[PDB]
Amino acid sequence: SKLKPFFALVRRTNPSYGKLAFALALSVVTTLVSLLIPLLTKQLVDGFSMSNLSGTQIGLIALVFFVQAGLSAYATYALNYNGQKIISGLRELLWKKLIKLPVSYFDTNASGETVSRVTNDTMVVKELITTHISGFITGIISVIGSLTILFIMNWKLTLLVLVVVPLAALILVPIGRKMFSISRETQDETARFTGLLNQILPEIRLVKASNAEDVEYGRGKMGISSLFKLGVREAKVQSLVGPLISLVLMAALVAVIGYGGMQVSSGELTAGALVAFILYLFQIIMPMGQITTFFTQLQKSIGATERMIEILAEEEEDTVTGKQIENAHLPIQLDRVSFGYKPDQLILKEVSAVIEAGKVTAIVGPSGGGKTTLFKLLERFYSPTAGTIRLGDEPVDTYSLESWREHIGYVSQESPLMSGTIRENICYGLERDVTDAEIEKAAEMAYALNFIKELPNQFDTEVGERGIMLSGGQRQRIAIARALLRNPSILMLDAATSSLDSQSEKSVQQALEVLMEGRTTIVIAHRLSTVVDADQLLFVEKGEITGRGTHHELMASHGLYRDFAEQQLKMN
Amino acid sequence: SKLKPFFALVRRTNPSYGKLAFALALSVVTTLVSLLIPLLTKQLVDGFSMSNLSGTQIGLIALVFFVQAGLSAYATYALNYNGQKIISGLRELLWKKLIKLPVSYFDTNASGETVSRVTNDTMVVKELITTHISGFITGIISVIGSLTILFIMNWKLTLLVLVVVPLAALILVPIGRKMFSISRETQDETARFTGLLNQILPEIRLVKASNAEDVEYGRGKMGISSLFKLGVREAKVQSLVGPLISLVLMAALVAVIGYGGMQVSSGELTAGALVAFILYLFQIIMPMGQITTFFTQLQKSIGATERMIEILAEEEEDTVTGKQIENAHLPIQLDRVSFGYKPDQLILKEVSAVIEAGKVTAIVGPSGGGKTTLFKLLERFYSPTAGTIRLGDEPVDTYSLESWREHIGYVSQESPLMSGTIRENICYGLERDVTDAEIEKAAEMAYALNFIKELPNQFDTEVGERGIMLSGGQRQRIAIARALLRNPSILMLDAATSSLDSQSEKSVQQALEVLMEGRTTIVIAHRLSTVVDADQLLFVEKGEITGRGTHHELMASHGLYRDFAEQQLKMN
Ligand SMILES: CCOc1ccc(-c2nc3ccc(-c4nc5ccc(N6CCN(C)CC6)cc5[nH]4)cc3[nH]2)cc1
Ligand SMILES: CCOc1ccc(-c2nc3ccc(-c4nc5ccc(N6CCN(C)CC6)cc5[nH]4)cc3[nH]2)cc1
């Protein structure tokens, strides 16, 4: 019943079932031919009584070897190609799901663990499909057929000792596990010793200042003693593990082969059956390891597939709400907004506010308050539950969130870079308009073309995957240029202004304020450099908005103590 | 020639060569017995025509098996025990050298890599001593003896094809290396794809805000398409490999064993000696891996022993200079002090200053100047080259450096913890005076016992190996108490101030100042309280001392001169 999710997930890829089944059957046929090769060898050994049939049998054996090799090659190619196709389909589905998934999932669950899980589990499912299931089938067939053929050919005597010998496994396995436990304990002790040394060494200045180095040496000696004692123990235990194992193996070996040799001398039904027996043992041994590896890999892959389905079970909506955007130019209202991330916690409580259209607005939050939550709420990445973020009559729930997003410009603190060139990084918002060649001209409108006039190149200017040769000063100018290029209708900022100092700050701020003067603006940062240019100021504390009006003149009557205390912490 | 350093290093630990040589000889004897065993098996197989001799030979074989097991067990125990003793000696020598190595070496070269080259190279040398040398000797003996015995047993026919077949290594090994190369290329591609995804995902806020889900999905699809192409190429290359490896190995096995059985059946002498031949094949194939592993580990160990000797090559001293300390109370003067880390750079140039005795002196330095160099120079951690830090009418080495350090208390920025209990913290000053039982009293006047008045425990007060349950203020207070306990004669601080806050800062400053009440004090911090807490002031700039006199005059003049820039940095 646990394989049903795996079958459904593989079905999601629309596999070529016929080709996979044909490849598996061809692998079975190859295993059956490898089950036949030793019989031909036995026939050759028995037929050495004359020389021409020896040559004919050698030719037949070579032909069977080549046929087996070719059949196995084609089966492996079909298996691997189908596995790669299934993995490509699975990765396509997973990446389509991840990108469309709401930003809440990324913030509240993980960022790199998701990509890790995706890649690792796709690789595990590939290993289960292309190798381990066929490997298990081939191993089962090989073991069963070899045991049956040994029973038919060399009969009870030798095969019974062959399957009584695995009592040697009941002596090897506990011994091997004791070796593993002692090795793990020694490794842990070594880790403790190196941790002690790595703790002591950085404070060597303090050690020598106190002139207690000898004492530390003594401490070190104790560690070197401890390991030694444990090491000695390992030695003793290894002296009961190293030889004994070999002994048992050799004993088993001799026994088996010895009986074969004996049955050759006594005249029993064994002339070339001994050679066939050794070849069948060699075909027996490896499939045991293959089966064990398959069992462990299935134990891992069931959980991997469960994680796959857990990723593929989420949902998100982009245009489902509706499509009725026409102007997107109206005062925005927060009405009874009270919701955070989980309804139980209630990180937001009864937040209400008004913002006019075409006026710069500020959102000042404390260090650890609800400024980030309020930003994400206004930025429409969080689904409203109780309150209403309205544009009048609350149309935001009846038209596409993508229509909202196309009309919003956003750069908050860094927005570092999107892997590519400058033209693509300012062309990230091609809403099917292609934007012609306005881009660089708009950069001149954003005072960016004259800033990039040095021009290492235009289209080949590579920021690299790392993105480190450009400081934060140049990238934020590019971000502002892109924001004004896409759709200057409503713009929101965490005031990407930084340590750039007035020289760059003056230019970037004057450009921004002159361009988006006629359109709605929101600022959410802490600095007061933007609040003087913000027509309306709002303050947030304890998940509640307190303060409406012009500016610092009005917080002088409302936040003259609490807001002043946070600003005092800021002056530090 | 290259083994001489290894032999010398082993000799440094008194190897007790007799036991090691006896263990090696016993291993050789065990290998000879293992070579003997298949001949006894062949005797039993040939003699299996009547039952009693079969039982006698089985008993003899079992006795030889047990003798071999016991001899191998004792040889392994002796080898491992001698190796552990050698490693303990080497670790003791290395740790003594490390703890006695100069501080200047530690900061300029490495911190954790030094511990790595005491923990990992010792393990490598152990692997070479206990296992790989004996393993190589026993493998060479086994291979040569088995080839010789097979030559005297089957002569031209079987053993020539025996040797000729593993020339199929010239067919297998290139194929395996091509497999490894293709696997490495695929792994690199998947690593690049994982990096691309881990770069895309954290920018999901910008990705959705700009509404480029389709673009990012397309880029991910291109990445997984490249991965699919790599997988298809790997699939083809593996399909032209796996069946080839199986075919070559099975053709080898069939040729050898079928020829053996063919000789057995024909009448050509082989009787039941095919059993001995198979056992000799099993004793031949195993030690090849041991020989190859020995060669690779010999390369690694001959690389690591040089690092061992280089660590052990360096030297340092603490009392060779002399022993001429009687008072250690005299004004401190700098006389044309010019030395840094390397004579070529000359980071210090003719630094000179006058410091009285019992007068607190403050040092002011810039962010990246030479304040740290002079700070470490005053502690005598760096060897004078040209200039002289004269204390004692010029001779500063007439007395032992340990004696100079003994009269010194030191805590600069953190001085985090010496892991264990507060007993170690207060007893690090146990310079043969044991302090009787006055440590708690010493804590009492030093204003530490009332700080620990909550008393979780007195002697069992534990801080943990990590040392995170106490704050910076408390550990700095304990450091001050230790400094006042050892020898409150001459003191230098960097005024460790991290999280004490005004109350604790003033408390520790007043207690510390009361405690010396007439002993020399040195301060090198940047805080203005620390610099007003000093009768005489200094200033460091460009590796030169510029400024002498009283606090107010210097602070007013230096700020007038150029120190106002550093001050402006301070208010920031
Ligand atoms: C399914 C049942 O059938 C079986 C078929 C084969 C084996 C079997 N597979 C083996 C693989 C390796 C060894 C083996 N590896 C060895 C390594 C070293 C030595 N030495 C060399 C030197 N030392 C000191 C003494 C012996 C013997 C060794 N014998 C024995 C083995 N016996 C067991 C059961
Ligand atoms: C000359 C010195 O003497 C030698 C004697 C033996 C070997 C030798 N050592 C071997 C170890 C493993 C294998 C082997 N590994 C296999 C893996 C798979 C299969 N299969 C299982 C299913 N497939 C499809 C068919 C056969 C057979 C296999 N046979 C062959 C081997 N031949 C080498 C030199």
Residue numbers in the entry:
A (entry chain A), B (entry chain B): 10 to 581
Question: What does the report in the manuscript say about this coordinate set?
Answer:
The Bacillus subtilis efflux pump BmrA, belongs to the type-IV family of MDR ABC transporters, conferring resistance to cervimycin-C secreted by the biotope competitor Streptomyces tendæ13. Type IV ABC transporters involved in MultiDrug Resistance (MDR) phenotype perform their function by undergoing a series of conformational changes pertaining to the alternating access mechanism. They are formed of two transmembrane domains (TMD) forming a cavity at their center where substrates bind, and of two nucleotide-binding domains (NBD) binding and hydrolyzing ATP-Mg2+ to fuel the system. Binding of ATP-Mg2+ to the NBDs bring them together, translating this conformational change to the TMDs which then open towards the outside (Outward-Facing, OF) where substrates are released. Importantly, the E504A catalytic mutant that still binds ATP but cannot hydrolyze it20 was used in this study; this thus allowed to probe a unidirectional transition from IF to OF states, BmrA being blocked when reaching the OF conformation when complexed with ATP-Mg2+ 9,12,14.
